[model samples]
Target: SMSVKKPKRDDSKDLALCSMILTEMETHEDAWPFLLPVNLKLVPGYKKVIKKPMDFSTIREKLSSGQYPNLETFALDVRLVFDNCETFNEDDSDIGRAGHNMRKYFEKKWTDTFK
Candidate 1:
């Protein structure tokens, strides 16, 4: 296997789409139909929910921190965002469903492309 410098990530493109999805909540808007924009906090993290998905700088910071270069690590970090969220559930609001779907999305992408 090959690796890059400590902070220069070669997987930027690989993670670009993921960041886009997270940074732009339109994907969530498309996923759970009929919900008001404010009600669909797909990925409400420790400090907040998915109102205005994290920006590129934040996403890049996360990935560049060397914490999410791999699928497993990324998956865990994604889940960590939802930890203790007020709306994190699998059988309730779209927030819950969104989180579930988001995780699955990452997992599938990992299987098909990243892994």
Candidate 2:
């Protein structure tokens, strides 16, 4: 007989950390510029629609709602915030480091069970 292996379960610490960081994001004025939406540089001769700033409030609301109707999409949007900002700024800055750390926080999952 053969046994199948399952991926290790993550502890809840990571989720908690993500929640904390998200809360901080709501008040972090320094992060606003990075969080806001901007027009794409490319899309040559593109027919344009009206552009608006990125809506972090909406993202935060969805995450806190706890329903997770679109887990994958949520993950992508959350990751995008970190990915785009951290890529441009050096981690030496407080906000930059915070974003980088938050990205790390989001990537982790936790479980009470020990191996």
Candidate 3:
């Protein structure tokens, strides 16, 4: 199928919402492990297991730079952080539980704001 050109729309509102959510997430109590990229030096096998690493700081930078043209892409990256966390940590472990909590918080905010 041929690519379809979507009509341009103002993105300022979505951008603001994303920024606000990101700020709140960064300050979340369970956000410690996801605030920055996984430390490969400290955590072995991360590079092998998690092919594309995503983090709050990276998502913020991308958003600030206008790399995310739409809210869906931005949300995908955020979800990826939690997905990678789940892939790397056991569900009962601290990091895993934090990821679950963070994902729950993000999804709820996303639904309330967009749906």
Candidate 4:
């Protein structure tokens, strides 16, 4: 329901949306547990995946290690989210299982870093 002015940077709008996603990754406990400090990348027209737990673990480690941000982290985070989107496709009858599986992902792959 909201819009932003065009940014001066190359594909800045995408970068901004990407930032919002990263913020969610950092602050939301459901996601925070699965996030890491990382330098994120933004493709012009393509969105990436978040398939497996290892993906989240990668982010959790990169971000928490205080390593400067890079495109690798961004690419990986995006990929993980994209890949894991399918995780939400389960039947309503097993909603609880879905959440539980997500929790397991956080616990297993995520690092202990806050950011």
Best by TM-score: 3
**Displacement of the residue 18 alpha carbon in candidate 4, Å:** 8.3
**How would you encode candidate 2's per-residue C-alpha lDDT over 66-85 as one tens digit per residue?**
64454456556677677655
Ranking by TM-score: 3, 2, 1, 4
Model 4: per-residue Cα lDDT over 1-115, one tens digit each: 2686765544434344444445554565455323442223542212233324434556545555644265345555555553453443343434334445564544333333212
How does each model score on lDDT?
A: 0.48, 0.55, 0.94, 0.44
Quick one: best lDDT, which candidate? 3
Off by over 4 Å in 4: 1-23, 29-52, 55-57, 64-69, 85-115
Q: In model 1, which residue pairs have backbone atoms overlapping below 3 Å?
A: 44-49
Could you tell me how far off, in angstroms, the CA of residue 76 lies in candidate 4 after the best superposition? 3.4
**Would you give me the overall lDDT of model 2?**
0.55
List model 3 lDDT by residue over 6-96, tens digit each. Answer: 7877666999999999998999999999999988888889988899999999999999998998999999999999999999999999999
TM-score of each: 0.42, 0.43, 0.90, 0.30
- Candidate 3 vs candidate 4: the lDDT winner is 3
- lDDT string, candidate 1, 33-101, tens digits: 212223334434523644333322444467666557564555554554444223435547765666566
Residue 4 of candidate 2: its Cα lDDT?
75
